Amino acid sequence: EPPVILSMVILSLTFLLGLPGNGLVLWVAGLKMQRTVNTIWFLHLTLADLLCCLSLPFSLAHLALQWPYGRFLCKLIPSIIVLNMFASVFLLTAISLDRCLVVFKPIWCQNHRNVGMACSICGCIWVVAFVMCIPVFVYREIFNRCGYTPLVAITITRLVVGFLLPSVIMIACYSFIVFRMQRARRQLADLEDNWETLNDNLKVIEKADNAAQVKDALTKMRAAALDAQKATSPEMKDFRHGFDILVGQIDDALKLANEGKVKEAQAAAEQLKTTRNAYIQKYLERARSTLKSQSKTFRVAVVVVAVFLVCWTPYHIFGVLSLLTDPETPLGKTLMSWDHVCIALASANSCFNPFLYALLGSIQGILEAAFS
Ligand SMILES: Cc1cc(C(c2ccc(Cl)cc2)c2ccc(Cl)cc2)sc1C(=O)N[C@@H](CCCN=C(N)N)C(=O)O
Predict the structure, then answer these.
(1) Of 56, 142, 252, 312, which alpha carbon lies 20 to 30 A from 49's?
(2) The CATH number of domain 2-183+295-370 is 1.20.1070.10
(3) Phi and psi (nearest 5°) for 141?
(4) Which residues are annotated with the PTM Sulfotyrosine?
(5) Which of 58, 59, 339 to mutate to test the pocket of ligand 1 (most atoms within 8 A of CB)?
C-alpha cells in the first residue's frame, strides 16, 4: 500500500522535471539549427516524450482518488502512453539502422539523403504507431474499475512487436558497428608505429658517425617506409606517390653512403623531412580527426538505447507474469500493487531521456554538439 504512495511521488517528480527540460530542448533545436536528416529524428523523439509527459496529470488524479467523471478519459489516457512507447521504439530503431547504414556503400549514402525522405519515414512511423495503438482504445471498458480472451493475445502481440524485434535489430546493428570500429584502430596503431620508428631512426642517423650505423639506420627506415606504404581515391594515389618519393630518397641516401661518404649521406637524410611534412602529415591529421567524431555519437546513441530498454523491461516482465499466473491467489494481491510502480517507471523514462543529452555533450553549444 505504501508502494502506491511511491508510485504517486514518482509520477509527480517526473511531471515536475519533464515539462521544462523537454520543452527547452524542443525550442532550442527547433528554432536555432538548420534542417538536416539527423536532428529531425531527435526532434521527433523529444516531441513524443513531451506528448507523453503532457498527459501525466490525469493519471495522478486517478491515482489519488482510487474516476467519477466520464468514461472517455478511462479509454483515452491509457492509449497515449502506449502510443509514446511505440513511437519511441520505432524512432530509436530507425536511428540505429541509419547510423549503421551510413558506413555502408555509397549507393545508399548518395541515393536519397534528403530531408523529405526523413519527414516521410517519420510520418510512416507515426502512422504505424497509431494503428498499433487503436486496439488499446477499442478493448477497454468500465465495469469504476478501469481494466480489460483477447487479453492472452494482446499482451503477446505487444511483447513481440514493441520489445523483441527492435531490440534484436539494434543489438545486431551496434555489434556490427563496434566490430567494424575495433578494426580501424589496429591499422591506425600500426601506421603510428611505422611513423614512430621512421622518426627516431631519422633522428639517430643525424648524430651517427661512421658509415655502418648510417647503413643500419637506413635499412630500418626503408623497411618501415615499405611497411607503412603497404598499409591502407586521389588522396590514396597521393599517399602512395609520397611514399614512393620517400623510398626513392632513401635509396639515394643508401647508395651515397655505400661508397664511403658520410656528410653527403647526412644531407640526403635531412632532405626527407620536407617531403615527409609536405605529404604525409595532412593524411595523419585527417586520420586522427576522422575518428573521435564517430565515438562522440556512437556512445550518445548507445546510452539512450540501453537506458530505454532498462526502463521498459519491468513493464513486460510483469505483463507476462500477470498473463501466466492465475488470479484469486495471494500472489496476485501484491502483483496488482507492484504493477503501479512498474508502470510508473515505464512512464518516468521520459524524464531520464533529456538529461543524457546535456550530460554526454551555452544551451545551444551543448545541445547542437550532442545532436551531431
Ligand atoms: C500505461 C498505463 C497506465 C495505467 C494506469 C496507471 C497510471 C499511473 C500509475 Cl502510477 C498506475 C496506474 C491508469 C489509470 C487510470 C488512467 Cl485514466 C490511466 C492510466 S494502465 C496502463 C497500460 O498501458 N496498461 C496496459 C496493460 C496493463 C497490464 N500491464 C502490465 N501489468 N504490465 C494496457 O491497458 O494495454
Answers:
(1) 142
(2) yes
(3) -155, 155
(4) 148
(5) 59
Pocket flag, ligand 1, residue 74 (CB < 6 Å): yes
CA 365, distance to chain mean position in Å, is 19
H or E element, residue 147 = strand 146-147
Q: List all residues 6 or more positions away from 191 whose beta carbon is below 8 Å from its beta carbon.
A: 228, 231, 284, 287
Nearest to 84 by CA among 135, 129, 145, 150: 129
Per the CB < 8 A criterion, the answer to whether 63 and 7 are in contact is yes
Are 37 and 370 in contact by the 8 Å Cβ rule? The answer is no
Is the beta carbon of 59 within 6 A of some atom in ligand 1? yes
Phi/psi for 146 (5° steps) reads -105, 90
∠ Cα 324 326 328 (to 5°): 160
* Structure-determination technique: cryo-EM
| Helix extents (H) in the chain | 2-31, 39-53, 56-64, 72-102, 106-110, 115-138, 150-159, 165-207, 211-230, 234-258, 263-270, 272-324, 330-359, 363-370
> At 75, phi and psi to the nearest 5?
-95, -25
Domain ranges across the chain: 2-183+295-370, 185-287
| Separation CA 131–CA 285 (nearest Å) | 50
Tell which atom from ligand 1 comes closest to the C-alpha of 147: 34
What is the C-alpha to C-alpha distance for residues 58 and 56, in angstroms, rounded to an integer?
Answer: 6
d(CA 47, CA 39): 12
Query: Resolution in A, one decimal?
Result: 3.5
CA of 343 to the centre of ligand 1 (A): 6
Handedness of CA 126, 303, 358, 17 (dihedral sign): positive
The architecture that CATH gives domain 185-287 is: Up-down Bundle (1.20)
What are the angstrom distances between the C-alpha of 229 and each of 90, 216, 247, 269, 371? 45, 20, 10, 19, 37
Buried b (16+ CB within 10 A) or exposed e, 297-318: bbebbbebbeebbebbebbbeb
